[PDB]
Amino acid sequence: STGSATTTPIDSLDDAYITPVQIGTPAQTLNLDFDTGSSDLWVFSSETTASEVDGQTIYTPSKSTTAKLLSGATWSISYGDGSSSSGDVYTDTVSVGGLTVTGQAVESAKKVSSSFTEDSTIDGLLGLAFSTLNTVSPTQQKTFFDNAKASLDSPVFTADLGYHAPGTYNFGFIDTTAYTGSITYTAVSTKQGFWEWTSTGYAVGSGTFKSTSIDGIADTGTTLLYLPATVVSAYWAQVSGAKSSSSVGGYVFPCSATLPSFTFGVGSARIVIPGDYIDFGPISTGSSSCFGGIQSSAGIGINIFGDVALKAAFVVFNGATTPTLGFASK
Numbered sequence: 001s002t003g004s005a006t007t008t009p010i011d012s013l014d015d016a017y018i019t020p021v022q023i024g025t026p027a028q029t030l031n032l033d034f035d036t037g038s039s040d041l042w043v044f045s046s047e048t049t050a051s052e053v054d055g056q057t058i059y060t061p062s063k064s065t066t067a068k069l070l071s072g073a074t075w076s077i078s079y080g081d082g083s084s085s086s087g088d089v090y091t092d093t094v095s096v097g098g099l100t101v102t103g104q105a106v107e108s109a110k111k112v113s114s115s116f117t118e119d120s121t122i123d124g125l126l127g128l129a130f131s132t133l134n135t136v137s138p139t140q141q142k143t144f145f146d147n148a149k150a151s152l153d154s155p156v157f158t159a160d161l162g163y164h165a166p167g168t169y170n171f172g173f174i175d176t177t178a179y180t181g182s183i184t185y186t187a188v189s190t191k192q193g194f195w196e197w198t199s200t201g202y203a204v205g206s207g208t209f210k211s212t213s214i215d216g217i218a219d220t221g222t223t224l225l226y227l228p229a230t231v232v233s234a235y236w237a238q239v240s241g242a243k244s245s246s247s248v249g250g251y252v253f254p255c256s257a258t259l260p261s262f263t264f265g266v267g268s269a270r271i272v273i274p275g276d277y278i279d280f281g282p283i284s285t286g287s288s289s290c291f292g293g294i295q296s297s298a299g300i301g302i303n304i305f306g307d308v309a310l311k312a313a314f315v316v317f318n319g320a321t322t323p324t325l326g327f328a329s330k
Contacts, residue, residue: 001099001100001148001151001152001153001172002098002099002152002153002170002171002172002173003095003096003097003098003099003148003170003171003172004097004098004168004169004170004171004175005019005020005021005096005097005168005169006019006020006166006167006168007019007034007161007162007166007167007168007169008166008167009162009164009165009166010119010121010122011121012164013280013281014161014162014163014164014223014307014311015223016033016119016121016122016221016223016307017033017034017161017167017220017307018031018032018033018121018122018123019031019032019033019034019096019126019169020032021094021095021096021126022093022094022095022096023043023059023064023092023093023094023106024059024061024063024064024065024066024067024092024093025064025065025066025092025093026064027095028057028059028060028063028064029057030043030044030057030058030059030123030124031057031121031122031123032122032123032124032125032126033122033124033125033126033221034125034126034128034159034169034220034221035125035126035127035128035129035219035220035221036127036128036129036159036194036195036217036218036219036220036221036317037080037127037129037194037217037219037220037221037222037304038077038079038125038127038129038133038221039127039128039129039130039131039132039133039134039135039143039193040075040077040107040125040127040134040135040136041094041104041105041106041107041124041125041126041127041143041144042075042077042085042087042106042107042108042109042124042125043058043059043106043107043108043109043123043124044056044057044058044059044109044112044116044123044124045058045059045060045061045087045108045109046058046059046060046061046062046108047087047088047108047109047110048087048108048109048110048111048112049110049111049112052111052112052114052116052117053117054117054118054120055120055121056120056122056123056124057123058123059106059108059123059124061090061092061106061108064092066092066093066102067090067091067092067106068090068091068092069088069089069090070088070089070090070091070105070136070139070141072138072139073088073089073105073136073137073138073139073141074086074087074088074089074136074137075087075088075089075107075135075136075137076135077135079221080222080300080304081115082113082115083112083113083115083116084111084112084113085109085111085112085113085116086109086110086111087107087108087109087110087111088107088108088110089105089106089107089108089136089141090105090106090108091103091104091105091106092104092106094106094144096126096144096169096171097169097170097171099148099152099171099172101144101147101148103147104144104147105134105136105141105142107136107141109124125221126144127143127221128143128144128145128157128220128317129143129193129194129195130143130190130193130194131143131146132190132193133193133194145157145171145317145319146319148171148172149319152171152172152173153172153173154172154173154174155172155318155319155320156171156172156173156174156316156317156318156319156320157169157170157171157172157317157319158170158174158175158178158314158315158316158317159220159310159314159315159317160175160178160179160314160315160330161220161307161310161311162311163274163276163277163311163312167311174316178314178330179313179314179328179329179330180328180329180330181328181329182328183314183316183326183327183328184266184267184268184269184326184327184328185267185316185318185324185325185326186198186266186267186324186325186326186327187324188318188323188324188325190323192217192302194217194218194219194302195217195218195219195317195323195325196215196216196217196218197215197216197217197218197325198213198214198215198216199213199214199215199216199264199265199266199305200212200213200214200265200266200267200268201213201214201264201265202214202227202231202262202263202264202265203262203263203270204234204235204238204260204261204262204263205238205260205261205275206260207238209263209265209270210234211265214227214228214231214264214303215302215303216297216302216303216304216305217302217303217304217305218305218310218315218317218325219304219305219306219310220306220307220310221306222304222306222307223280223293223306223307223308224280224293224294224295224304224306224307224308225262225273225278225293225294225295225304225305225306225308225309226295226296226297226300226302226303226304226306227294227295227296227297227303228296228297228298228303229296229297229298232251232294232295232296235260235262235294236251236253236292236294238260239253239254239257239259239260240254240257241253241254241257242254242257242292244296245289248283248289248291250291250292250295250296251291251292251294251295251296252283252289252290252291252292253289253290253292254288254289254290255281255282255287255288255289255290256288257290258275259275259276259278259279260275261273261274261275262275262278262294264305264309266327269327271309271312271313271327271329272312272329273308273309273312274312277293277308277311277312278292278293278294278308279292279293280292280293293308294308312329313327313328313329313330314327314328314329314330315327316328
C-alpha cells in the first residue's frame with residue numbers, strides 16, 4: 001500500500017505545515033502538523049477545554065462508529081518551544097493520503113497550552129519520530145508510520161516541503177520525479193528516539209566548505225535551523241548589520257539585506273539553502289529588523305535541522321530494520 005498527501009504552509013513565512021488527515025467513521029478531516037521530532041498523534045477534540053479552543057476543527061469520538069476508548073490511557077507532552085498538551089486516548093481509523101491504519105492511537109486533548117490555542121490553523125500533531133518517545137501511559141503507543149510500515153510497499157516515508165508553496169508527504173514509495181540527481185543516504189541513530197544523523201560540514205554563501213561533524217535531528221516540526229554557535233556566527237558575520245539580540249531571542253538582521261545561502265553536508269553530497277529561505281521577516285509588524293532563520297542551538301542541547309533546512313531537499317525517512325536518512329536536491 002502507499003499514501004500521498006499535500007502539505008501546505010500555514011502562513012506566508014512557512015512557520016509550519018499542515019496536512020489533511022481523515023479520522024473516524026464517517027471521516028472527520030483534521031489538518032495536522034506532521035512532526036518528525038515527536039511521536040504522539042494528538043488532536044483538538046470535543047473533550048478540550050472550551051476556553052482553549054479558538055477556530056480549530058475538533059475530533060468528536062462520539063460521532064465515530066469505529067472510535068473506542070483506550071481504557072486507562074493518558075498522555076502529556078511538552079515540546080522544545082515550551083508548549084504542551086495532555087488528555088486521554090482513543091483508537092480509531094486514521095487515513096493519510098489514501099493510506100489507512102486501523103486501531104491507531106488518537107490522543108484526545110483535554111488541555112492545550114496557549115500557543116496551540118492561538119494557532120487556529122493546526123488541529124493537532126501527527127508524530128513521526130520513533131515510537132519510544134510516545135508519551136501514552138501506562139501502555140506506550142505506536143506512531144502512524146510504525147503501524148502502517150508492515151503494509152507499505154517500502155518501509156519509508158518522504159518529506160518534500162515547499163518554499164512558500166505546497167509540498168508532499170509520501171508514504172511507502174520514493175517518487176523519483178520529485179528530486180534531481182541522486183539520493184545520498186546517511187546513518188541514523190535512534191538512541192534518543194529521533195531521526196538523528198551527522199552532517200559532514202557547511203559553507204556560507206560562496207565560501208569554502210568546512211568539513212566538521214555536526215550531530216543533529218531531522219525535524220519537520222521545527223521551523224528554523226538550529227546549529228552550534230560557531231557555525232551560526234560564521235553565517236551572520238556575512239550579513240552587514242546582523243547581530244544577536246537577547247531582547248528578541250536570537251539573530252536579527254536589516255530587512256534591507258540580501259542574505260547569503262547556507263550549504264550543509266550530507267556525506268560527500270551538498271544541500272544548498274537559498275538565502276531567501278533564511279528570511280523570516282520583521283520581528284514585529286512594520287519593523288525594519290528581520291528575524292533570522294539560522295539560529296544557535298547552544299540553549300537547546302541538540303542541533304535541529306528544521307524546515308528551513310529540510311525544505312531545501314527531498315528527504316527520505318527510511319524505516320528499514322536499520323533506519324537511515326536520505327537527502328536529495330530538488
